[PDB]
Amino acid sequence: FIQTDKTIYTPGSTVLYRIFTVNHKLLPVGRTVMVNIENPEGIPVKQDSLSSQNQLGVLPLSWDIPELVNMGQWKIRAYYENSPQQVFSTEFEVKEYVLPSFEVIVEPTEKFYYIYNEKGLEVTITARFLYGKKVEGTAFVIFGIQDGEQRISLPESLKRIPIEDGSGEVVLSRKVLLDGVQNPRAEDLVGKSLYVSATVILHSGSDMVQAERSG
């Protein structure tokens, strides 16, 4: 099992990672482990060969990120020396970013959508700060359909609601949804999923956060 400290990193920082070595009874043991670090293209950059002997099954390691580096989804692969066919992996992302000051939870009222519900799909937008306080501002919410991996957006469902006391409500109507597929039959939408994206902007205009609930 591979533990990382964060799930996303900037160029120039350092990645700290621990490796927990146990056997088939989930008790710690000392073996020889080969460690790999792969780029988004799948090519290993740094290889090591450590031993968890006399370490209580915890292997602390590190890796520096260069300033000029490829963004994307990196990978860390590890395997026992006696069983090279069984590889264990964990990913992490590399992106240029800054930290936001608030989160946006996009949760619909139900965890699904019924076809013949004339009320439509009601989605609750929750926005609070990291320290627990509530958020004043304005949101931008748009729905969309997804068939496999080919996504089809729905520009008819754009609403602009104000966010008062960290809360907001938005409804996608059934007539807007049936007009987007150009489908006279409503039974062909069984199987497809819906995705909602929200973008809340503060009253000071200093920060904004995009959030998405799909599937």
Partner 1 sequence: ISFHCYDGYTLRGSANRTCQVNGRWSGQTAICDNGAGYCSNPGIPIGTRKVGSQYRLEDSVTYHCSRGLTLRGSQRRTCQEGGSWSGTEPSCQDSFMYDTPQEVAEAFLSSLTETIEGVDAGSMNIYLVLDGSGSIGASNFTGAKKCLVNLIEKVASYGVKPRYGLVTYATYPKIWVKVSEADSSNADWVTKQLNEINYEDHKLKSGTNTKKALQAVYSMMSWPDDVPPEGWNRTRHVIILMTDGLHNMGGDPITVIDEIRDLLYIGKDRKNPREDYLDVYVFGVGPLVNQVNINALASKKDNEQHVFKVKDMENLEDVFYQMIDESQSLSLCGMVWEHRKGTDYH
Partner 2 sequence: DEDIIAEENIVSRSEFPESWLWNVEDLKEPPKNGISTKLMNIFLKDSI
Partner 3 sequence: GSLVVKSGQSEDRQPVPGQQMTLKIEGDHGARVVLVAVDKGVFVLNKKNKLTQSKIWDVVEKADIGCTPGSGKDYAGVFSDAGLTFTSSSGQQTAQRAELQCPQ
Query: Which residues, listed in sequence order, are joined to residue 181 by a DSSP beta bridge?
Result: none
Q: Out of 44, 60, 72, 100, which residue is the one contacting partner 1 (CB under 8 A)?
A: 60
Q: Out of 1, 3, 18, 70, which residue is the one contacting partner 1 (CB under 8 A)?
A: 18
* Structure tokens that stand for 165 in this block: 């006391």
CA 165/CA 136 separation, integer angstroms: 6
Q: Out of 116, 131, 150, 155, which residue is the one contacting partner 2 (CB under 8 A)?
A: 131
Phi, psi of 52 (to 5 degrees): -90, 15
Choose between 3 and 70: whose C-beta lies nearer to partner 3.
3
CB of 10 to partner 3, least distance (A): 11
Pattern 89-108, binding to partner 3, x per CB under 8 A?
A: -xxxx-x-x-xxx-xx----
Stretch that binds partner 1, among 6-14, 72-80, 166-174, 190-198 (CB under 8 A): 6-14
* Structure tokens that stand for 91 in this block: 């990913």
CB 47 within 8 A of CB 76: no
| Residue that the structure tokens 């995705």 belong to | 195
Stretch that binds partner 1, among 55-63, 80-88, 105-113, 177-185 (CB under 8 A): 55-63
Choose between 114 and 131: whose C-beta lies nearer to partner 2.
131
Regarding 87 and contact with partner 3 (CB under 8 A), the answer is no
Burial class (CB in 10 A: 0-12, 13-18, 19+), 198: buried
With vertex at residue 122, the alpha carbon angle to CA 116 and CA 124, rounded to the nearest 5 degrees, is 160
Please list, in sequence order, all residues whose beta carbon lies within 8 angstroms of the beta carbon of residue 111, skipping any fewer than 6 positions away. none
Regarding 66 and contact with partner 1 (CB under 8 A), the answer is yes
CB of 186 to partner 3, least distance (A): 34
Q: How many residues appear in the chain?
A: 215
Residue 14 binding: pick among partner 1, partner 3, partner 2, none (C-beta 5-8 Å cut-off by kind): partner 1
Contact residues: partner 1, CB under 8 A:
12-14, 16, 18, 60-64, 66-67
